[PDB]
Design an enzyme around this catalytic site. Structure first.
Site, PDB file in Angstrom:
ATOM      1  N   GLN A   1       0.816  -1.220   0.000  1.00  0.00           N
ATOM      2  CA  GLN A   1       0.000   0.000   0.000  1.00  0.00           C
ATOM      3  C   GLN A   1       0.845   1.264   0.000  1.00  0.00           C
ATOM      4  O   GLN A   1       0.354   2.336  -0.307  1.00  0.00           O
ATOM      5  CB  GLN A   1      -0.984   0.007   1.173  1.00  0.00           C
ATOM      6  CG  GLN A   1      -0.339   0.192   2.502  1.00  0.00           C
ATOM      7  CD  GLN A   1      -1.338  -0.015   3.627  1.00  0.00           C
ATOM      8  OE1 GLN A   1      -1.900  -1.099   3.782  1.00  0.00           O
ATOM      9  NE2 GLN A   1      -1.542   1.006   4.421  1.00  0.00           N
TER      10      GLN A   1
ATOM     11  N   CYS B   1      -5.367   0.238   3.356  1.00  0.00           N
ATOM     12  CA  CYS B   1      -5.499  -1.129   3.837  1.00  0.00           C
ATOM     13  C   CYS B   1      -6.949  -1.622   3.769  1.00  0.00           C
ATOM     14  O   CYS B   1      -7.197  -2.787   3.476  1.00  0.00           O
ATOM     15  CB  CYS B   1      -4.944  -1.240   5.253  1.00  0.00           C
ATOM     16  SG  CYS B   1      -5.588  -0.002   6.368  1.00  0.00           S
TER      17      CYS B   1
ATOM     18  N   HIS C   1      -6.418  -1.212  11.385  1.00  0.00           N
ATOM     19  CA  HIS C   1      -5.727  -1.684  10.202  1.00  0.00           C
ATOM     20  C   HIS C   1      -6.514  -2.815   9.567  1.00  0.00           C
ATOM     21  O   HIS C   1      -6.677  -3.875  10.166  1.00  0.00           O
ATOM     22  CB  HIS C   1      -4.328  -2.155  10.578  1.00  0.00           C
ATOM     23  CG  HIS C   1      -3.474  -2.505   9.402  1.00  0.00           C
ATOM     24  ND1 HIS C   1      -3.168  -1.602   8.412  1.00  0.00           N
ATOM     25  CD2 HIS C   1      -2.868  -3.660   9.054  1.00  0.00           C
ATOM     26  CE1 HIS C   1      -2.413  -2.190   7.500  1.00  0.00           C
ATOM     27  NE2 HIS C   1      -2.213  -3.439   7.868  1.00  0.00           N
TER      28      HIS C   1
ATOM     29  N   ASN D   1      -1.553  -9.240   4.841  1.00  0.00           N
ATOM     30  CA  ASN D   1      -1.389  -7.811   5.043  1.00  0.00           C
ATOM     31  C   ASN D   1      -1.174  -7.180   3.672  1.00  0.00           C
ATOM     32  O   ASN D   1      -1.157  -7.889   2.648  1.00  0.00           O
ATOM     33  CB  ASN D   1      -0.225  -7.562   6.008  1.00  0.00           C
ATOM     34  CG  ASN D   1      -0.188  -6.144   6.587  1.00  0.00           C
ATOM     35  OD1 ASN D   1      -1.118  -5.357   6.453  1.00  0.00           O
ATOM     36  ND2 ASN D   1       0.943  -5.827   7.249  1.00  0.00           N
TER      37      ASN D   1
END
Length: 220
Positions: free
Chosen positions: A22, A28, A167, A187
């Site tokens: 990102q 995110c 997140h 992630n």
């Protein structure tokens, strides 16, 4: 506990795209949402295709309570896709880690969404069920703690973690490693982060880091 597989890894079923980076854009939430939809798209069509996080950043904006590179909601991103009647492929609408004008075009549509489901707060067995039976699930975690950034291997357990999530990430599996139950989390800080972009986070340890606080998944 519900009767379910002891472990799941949606990467084994070819339902998880490459880990994205990102950069210095708080997208995110967008990566989390597209990742969940990517799996559904594979389940439905047999084709694994990265979907445009940038499309969400640029287009799922104020109407959806989202703020682009300054944060957003996975659920409202899903509703945008529903309302918009599609989301473009990543290849067609690449990620630039910046807020841009909405450039959605239906000719580059690679997926749709008809609905999304929010799981009940903090219920890890319900989360397990959804990961087993539905697919990868969008979640928020508390990733504020220095240990998160430095995670390399094993199962992440941080006593200072909270249920105040900040997140957006994607639960793509669960299991047990060396006696520690975990959630397998994709992630969006690139493959340098953790285990080729993944982190195993403690499971059944009191909703650790808020992982089961706000789960949702879309359907095509």
């Amino acid at each position: 506990n519900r009767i379910l597989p002891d472990s799941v890894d949606w990467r084994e079923k070819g339902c998880v795209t490459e880990v994205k980076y990102q950069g210095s854009c708080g997208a995110c939430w967008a990566f989390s949402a597209v990742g969940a939809l990517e799996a559904q798209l594979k389940l439905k069509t047999g084709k694994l295709v990265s979907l445009s996080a940038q499309n969400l950043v640029d287009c799922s904006t104020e109407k959806y309570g989202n703020k682009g590179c300054n944060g957003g909601f996975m659920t409202t991103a899903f509703q945008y896709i529903i309302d918009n009647k599609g989301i473009d492929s990543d290849a067609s609408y690449p990620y630039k880690a910046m807020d841009q004008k909405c450039q959605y075009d239906s000719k580059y549509r690679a997926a749709t969404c008809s609905k999304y489901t929010e799981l009940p707060y903090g219920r890890e067995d319900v989360l397990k069920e959804a990961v087993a039976n539905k697919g990868p699930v969008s979640v928020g975690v508390d990733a504020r703690h220095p240990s998160f950034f430095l995670y390399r291997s094993g199962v992440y357990y941080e006593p200072s973690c909270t249920q105040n999530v900040n997140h957006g990430v994607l639960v793509v599996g669960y299991g047990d490693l060396n006696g520690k139950e975990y959630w397998l989390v994709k992630n969006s800080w690139g493959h340098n982060f953790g285990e080729e972009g993944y982190i195993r986070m403690a499971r059944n340890k009191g909703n650790h880091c808020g992982i089961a606080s706000f789960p949702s998944y879309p359907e095509i």
